[PDB]
Design an enzyme around this catalytic site. Structure first.
Site, PDB file in Angstrom:
ATOM      1  N   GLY A   1       0.676  -1.227  -0.299  1.00  0.00           N
ATOM      2  CA  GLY A   1       0.099  -0.077   0.407  1.00  0.00           C
ATOM      3  C   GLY A   1       0.964   1.400   0.079  1.00  0.00           C
ATOM      4  O   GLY A   1       2.062   1.076  -0.642  1.00  0.00           O
ATOM      5  N   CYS A   2       0.615   2.245   0.611  1.00  0.00           N
ATOM      6  CA  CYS A   2       1.156   3.597   0.279  1.00  0.00           C
ATOM      7  C   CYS A   2       2.333   3.035   1.231  1.00  0.00           C
ATOM      8  O   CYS A   2       1.978   2.496   2.179  1.00  0.00           O
ATOM      9  CB  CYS A   2       0.191   4.638   0.973  1.00  0.00           C
ATOM     10  SG  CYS A   2       1.147   6.155   1.719  1.00  0.00           S
ATOM     11  N   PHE A   3       3.120   3.960   0.629  1.00  0.00           N
ATOM     12  CA  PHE A   3       4.864   3.775   1.376  1.00  0.00           C
ATOM     13  C   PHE A   3       5.509   4.614   2.311  1.00  0.00           C
ATOM     14  O   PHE A   3       6.898   4.107   3.336  1.00  0.00           O
ATOM     15  CB  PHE A   3       5.924   2.944   0.432  1.00  0.00           C
ATOM     16  CG  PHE A   3       6.009   4.584  -0.480  1.00  0.00           C
ATOM     17  CD1 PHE A   3       6.219   5.579  -0.469  1.00  0.00           C
ATOM     18  CD2 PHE A   3       6.419   4.789  -1.507  1.00  0.00           C
ATOM     19  CE1 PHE A   3       6.123   6.366  -1.490  1.00  0.00           C
ATOM     20  CE2 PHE A   3       7.119   5.229  -2.509  1.00  0.00           C
ATOM     21  CZ  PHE A   3       5.885   6.335  -2.682  1.00  0.00           C
ATOM     22  N   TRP A   4       4.428   5.312   2.989  1.00  0.00           N
ATOM     23  CA  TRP A   4       4.947   6.267   4.092  1.00  0.00           C
ATOM     24  C   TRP A   4       5.109   5.902   5.764  1.00  0.00           C
ATOM     25  O   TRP A   4       5.726   5.928   6.744  1.00  0.00           O
ATOM     26  CB  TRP A   4       4.353   7.728   4.068  1.00  0.00           C
ATOM     27  CG  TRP A   4       3.786   7.580   3.228  1.00  0.00           C
ATOM     28  CD1 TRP A   4       4.939   8.121   2.567  1.00  0.00           C
ATOM     29  CD2 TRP A   4       2.820   9.360   2.505  1.00  0.00           C
ATOM     30  NE1 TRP A   4       5.088  10.022   1.079  1.00  0.00           N
ATOM     31  CE2 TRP A   4       3.894   9.433   1.716  1.00  0.00           C
ATOM     32  CE3 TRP A   4       1.443   9.466   3.341  1.00  0.00           C
ATOM     33  CZ2 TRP A   4       3.078  11.134   1.063  1.00  0.00           C
ATOM     34  CZ3 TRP A   4       1.347  10.606   2.554  1.00  0.00           C
ATOM     35  CH2 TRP A   4       1.136  11.359   1.607  1.00  0.00           C
TER      36      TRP A   4
ATOM     37  N   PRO B   1       4.657   2.180   5.801  1.00  0.00           N
ATOM     38  CA  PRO B   1       6.041   1.240   6.187  1.00  0.00           C
ATOM     39  C   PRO B   1       7.454   1.348   6.121  1.00  0.00           C
ATOM     40  O   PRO B   1       8.361   0.803   6.675  1.00  0.00           O
ATOM     41  CB  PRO B   1       5.988   0.893   4.689  1.00  0.00           C
ATOM     42  CG  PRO B   1       4.102   0.550   4.842  1.00  0.00           C
ATOM     43  CD  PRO B   1       3.923   1.621   4.488  1.00  0.00           C
TER      44      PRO B   1
END
Length: 205
Positions: free
Chosen positions: A10-13, A15
């Site tokens: 999903g959105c990588f911020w 993680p």
């Protein structure tokens, strides 16, 4: 010389901040992988997925432990065709592939549901735009500017372990007590240590 894991979830911020808070994770970078176009970017993603590259020290943390974190950060029990957010593990060797397949099987048994994570060979990973890296830290102005000067610039900062930990702290994934032990490791001169510590303490309040 370090080991590499590449995941999409999903959105990588989130993680980036989550994996960057973990002991054994040496550095993180966000980017794009899984597609078939060269040099994708945020507004020209083609078929790539938002991904994270984790550089880890295999003497400290195992790939299996990273996979456990990956599957605790999202629960991919749906089949979608939204490439940009698809749950994927990009394996770099057959050892990673076999560990991923085995753990996926163990999860599908323990909790009862089919997991739709695609376990696929890593082709090319393309670094994302600078504004996406260490997203939370980068948008915490005083801490960011202080750390960037200490590290000698944007590139040096975002590649560092301490920036990964600081980004996790801002996102709420690392305690201040743990962060302070990480600052100690870098061996800053005492005035830089106190300057950073004061911003960090004032953020916790």
């Amino acid at each position: 010389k370090l080991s590499i894991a590449v995941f999409a979830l999903g959105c990588f911020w989130g993680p980036d901040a989550q994996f960057g808070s973990i002991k054994g994770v040496v550095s993180t970078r966000v980017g794009y992988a899984g597609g078939t176009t060269n040099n994708p970017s945020y507004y020209n993603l083609g078929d790539h997925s938002a991904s994270i590259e984790i550089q880890y020290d295999a003497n400290v943390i195992t790939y299996g432990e990273l996979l456990n974190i990956f599957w605790n950060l999202h629960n991919p029990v749906y089949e979608t065709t939204n490439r940009q957010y698809m749950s994927r593990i990009f394996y770099l060797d057959d050892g990673q592939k076999s560990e991923a397949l085995e753990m996926k099987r163990q999860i599908e048994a323990a909790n009862g549901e089919k997991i739709y994570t695609e376990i696929v060979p890593l082709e090319n990973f393309y670094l994302a735009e600078g504004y996406h890296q260490k997203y939370y830290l980068q948008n915490t102005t005083k801490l960011y500017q202080t750390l960037k000067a200490i590290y000698g610039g944007f590139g040096n900062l975002v590649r560092s372990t301490l920036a990964a930990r600081m980004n996790g702290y801002i996102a709420g994934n690392l305690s201040i007590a743990s962060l302070k032990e990480e600052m100690d490791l870098v061996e800053l001169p005492e005035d830089q240590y106190e300057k950073v510590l004061s911003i960090v303490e004032e953020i916790k309040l």
